């Protein structure tokens, strides 16, 4: 009967809670109370990219730490040269309702999608000299919220329907679907080794998934509202999530519970974006108050504030070399910080 | 001191800038409409008279209209509704024949209250199309309005009942000093709907220009 299964599920949840309690012998704050603070981080704006004529919804660095891809609600996906502020490409979109971008870690392809429920893959390197639509991956019943390349032929996507998918690009088919969430999946982060990935959903939960096997390995809770952003710690053993609770949280996979919470009484607005700096000491979060806060990942203290956006900071990213920080906002601009 | 290739790259970037500006100029001279309505509300008839998002283009009096239908997208509205902030107007379709079918009118009222009082549409106006008035006349002749509105008092005739529904929908607006509701009664075979939308949009544009020049 349903009642017996409900009772068994409640018992298993209690068992998991007790197991997690047993492992909570110390807090990250207690252990990190004996290390020096990073100090005051005063990062300044080194560039301003002035092409878009609408709200920028997604940005993605290239692996060379010099090229960027941005997408705005005016279609017009733009590939930028950060060093010279040169526009390398301007790709017109078949649907202006774009919400995610991705830059393949080879530089040969770019992906984007949104309210059309399709993930479009564009080839950047063609004999004809123009950017062409290489693939249109259809199969999601909801909006596309995030997409990330694993290689030139594999891409992982998250949808408004409570599902993630892994797509072969040649064939144009879902190879494995991830079906555990009860709410819209909003974010998506790949592990550095590209064997696991974490997805945060509107059910106020994050899930660690195995790409090859195709099953939810772990589920992390604690947030009170939806999770909008998620990012892996550089070593792949931890990840940070940002929610509409005006809170970020750092979770550890091996301990299988929350380690830390980043919040302040003066912050009452949701978090749009989250990223780590190289070595993971700093945690950058873009908020709805037109601001980006820099937190010390080991000590809850706030290190800095990247002011300078006149509308909410919708996305940010850190280069693979760690030199700069890109932030794009609902103002048509995106800035580079150092 | 740039190298020759650097100068060529700068030239190509400037060409890209020129194209982007031209596209922005073209896009600004366009009227954006968000089409909302309950299931079977008749918004398909309006789309005639005028698997994710559906985009319909048309023109009227040299004015270009882009209508966006989001009814096929069943997900958390709170996560993509802000995408339509800045839309020129919202066209909300309600079927008048739905008063005695299943409380459908109450579902429509709840959706209208959610959209009208939404924080993203505080200054966005609503064109309210009340559809299926012939079927409504038939049913109201055969069935009472009190099924949907137990507190209704007045003639169980077409005019008073229709006016009652209109004011019931219009009183859900809790911001009467910021936005306007333009209500039109429509039917299956009609020709004035496009003119209705054009007139409402022109009024909205004039009011926006007055705000811009500072007269409000």
């Amino acid at each position, epitope marked *: 009967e349903l009642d017996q299964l409900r009772q068994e599920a409640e018992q298993l949840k209690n068992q998991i809670r007790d197991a997690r309690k047993a492992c909570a012998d110390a807090t990250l704050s207690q252990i990190t109370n004996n290390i020096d603070p990073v100090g005051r981080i005063q990062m300044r704006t080194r560039r301003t990219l002035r092409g878009h004529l609408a709200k920028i919804y997604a940005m993605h660095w290239g692996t060379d730490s010099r090229l960027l891809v941005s997408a705005s609600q005016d279609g017009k996906l733009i590939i930028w040269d950060s060093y010279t502020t*040169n526009k390398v490409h301007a790709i017109p979109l078949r649907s202006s309702w774009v919400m995610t971008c991705a830059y393949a870690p080879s530089g040969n392809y770019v992906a984007c999608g949104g309210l059309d429920n399709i993930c479009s893959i564009y080839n950047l390197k063609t004999r*004809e*000299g123009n950017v062409r639509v290489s693939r249109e991956l259809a199969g999601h019943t909801g909006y596309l919220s995030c997409c990330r390349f694993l290689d030139d032929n594999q891409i992982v996507t998250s949808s408004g329907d409570t599902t993630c998918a892994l797509w072969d690009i040649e064939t144009g088919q879902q190879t494995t679907t991830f079906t555990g969430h009860t709410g819209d999946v909003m974010s998506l982060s790949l592990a550095p080794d590209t064997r696991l990935f974490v997805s945060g959903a509107c059910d106020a939960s994050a899930k660690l998934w195995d790409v090859r096997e195709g099953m939810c390995r772990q589920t992390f809770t604690g947030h009170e509202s939806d999770i909008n952003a998620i990012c892996f710690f550089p070593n792949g053993n931890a990840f940070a999530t940002g929610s509409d609770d005006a809170t970020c949280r750092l979770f550890d996979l091996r301990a299988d519970q929350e380690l830390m919470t980043y919040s302040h009484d003066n912050i009452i607005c949701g978090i749009t974006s989250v990223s780590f700096s190289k070595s993971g000491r700093l945690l950058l979060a873009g908020y709805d108050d037109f601001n980006c806060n820099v937190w010390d990942a080991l000590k809850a203290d706030r290190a800095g504030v990247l002011a300078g956006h006149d509308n909410r900071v919708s996305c940010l990213g850190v280069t693979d070399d760690g030199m700069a920080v890109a932030t794009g906002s609902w103002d048509s601009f995106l800035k580079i910080w150092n | *001191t740039l*190298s020759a*290739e650097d100068k060529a790259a700068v*030239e*190509r970037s400037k060409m890209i800038d020129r194209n982007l500006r031209e596209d922005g100029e073209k896009a600004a001279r366009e009227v954006k409409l968000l089409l909302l309505g309950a299931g079977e509300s008749g918004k398909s008839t309006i789309v005639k008279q005028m698997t994710g998002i559906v985009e319909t283009h048309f023109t009227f009096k040299d004015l270009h209209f882009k209508m966006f239908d989001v009814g096929a997208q069943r997900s958390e509205r709170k996560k993509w509704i802000h995408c339509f902030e800045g839309v020129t107007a919202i066209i909300f379709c309600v079927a008048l024949s739905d008063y005695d079918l299943v409380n459908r009118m109450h579902e429509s009222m709840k959706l209208f209250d959610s959209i009208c009082n939404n924080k993203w549409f505080t200054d966005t106006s609503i064109i309210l199309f009340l559809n299926k008035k012939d079927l409504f006349e038939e049913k109201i002749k055969k069935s009472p309005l009190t099924i949907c509105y137990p507190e209704y008092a007045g003639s169980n005739t077409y005019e008073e009942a229709a006016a009652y529904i209109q004011c019931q929908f219009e009183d859900l607006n809790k911001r009467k000093d910021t936005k306007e509701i333009y209500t039109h009664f429509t039917c299956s075979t009609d020709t004035k709907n496009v003119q209705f939308v054009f007139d409402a949009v022109t009024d909205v544009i004039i009011k926006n220009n007055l705000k811009d020049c500072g007269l409000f």
Partner: single-chain antibody, 231 residues
Framework: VQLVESGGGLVQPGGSRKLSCSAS????????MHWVRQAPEKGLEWVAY????????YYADTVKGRFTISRDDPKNTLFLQMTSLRSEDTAMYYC??????????????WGQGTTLTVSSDIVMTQATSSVPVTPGESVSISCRSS???????????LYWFLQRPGQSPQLLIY???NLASGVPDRFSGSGSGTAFTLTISRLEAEDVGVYYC?????????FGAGTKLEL
């Protein structure tokens, strides 16, 4: 991708000729175009450049004031109007494609060319004019320049082209170290300012021909004499 030149022939001194190059297979409007020429028994000589958008025009000094370069993007045609022709203008003219953005490969595609018969720059030196070699061996071709080609932005603007018997030049290396698309990994390039080397490992057939080094640091573009490999 196809660039077909036409309009060549035999002219008397003092006459004029309008050469044309019909382009197909690519976004012609997005590419800058070059006119290059080769004398009957000599190396390559850069003639003219017209940029994408027709904003920038450059001419060689030997043709300035006489030649005019133009393009019709809708018809995908490139025109070279030559007036006051001299015996020095007798040559085969090639149209060359070139696109400029970060990471691009300019001078990537060359036409077949058309023959015309008339009745403070940087000097590139190809010290060796000929090199006999057997298949399976390694070869090294050297090129020198008057001034360092290394710019403050990190790029060394050296290009290596290979011209096989009866064929138009094809790009091997761009910016001294980058292997062109479709080129076997046998080829490699290295060097520092004023001294550059192209290394061919496991020399095979169809590598016979003339290798040219070109600088793209400053206009006018200048070629070396060309080093010939024969089996």
């Amino acid at each position: 991708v196809q660039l077909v030149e036409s309009g060549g022939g035999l002219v008397q001194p003092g006459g004029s000729r309008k050469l044309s190059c019909s382009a197909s297979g690519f976004a012609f409007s997005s590419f800058g175009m070059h006119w290059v020429r080769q004398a009957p028994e000599k190396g390559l000589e850069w003639v003219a450049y017209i940029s994408s958008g027709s904003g920038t025009i450059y001419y060689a000094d030997t043709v300035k004031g006489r030649f005019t370069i133009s393009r019709d993007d809708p018809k995908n045609t490139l025109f070279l109007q030559m007036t006051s022709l001299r015996s020095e203008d007798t040559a085969m003219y090639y149209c060359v494609r070139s696109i400029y953005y970060y990471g691009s490969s300019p001078f990537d595609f060359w036409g077949q060319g058309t023959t015309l018969t008339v009745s403070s720059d940087i000097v590139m030196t190809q010290a060796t004019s000929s090199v006999p070699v057997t298949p399976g061996e390694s070869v090294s071709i050297s090129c020198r320049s008057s001034k360092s080609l290394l710019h403050s932005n990190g790029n060394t603007y050296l290009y290596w082209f290979l011209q096989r018997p009866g064929q138009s030049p094809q790009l091997l290396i761009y910016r001294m170290s980058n292997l062109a698309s479709g080129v076997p990994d046998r080829f490699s390039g290295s060097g520092s300012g004023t001294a550059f080397t192209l290394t061919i490992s496991r020399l095979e057939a169809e590598d016979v021909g003339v290798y040219y080094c070109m600088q793209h640091l400053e206009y006018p573009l200048t070629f070396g004499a060309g080093t010939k490999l024969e089996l």
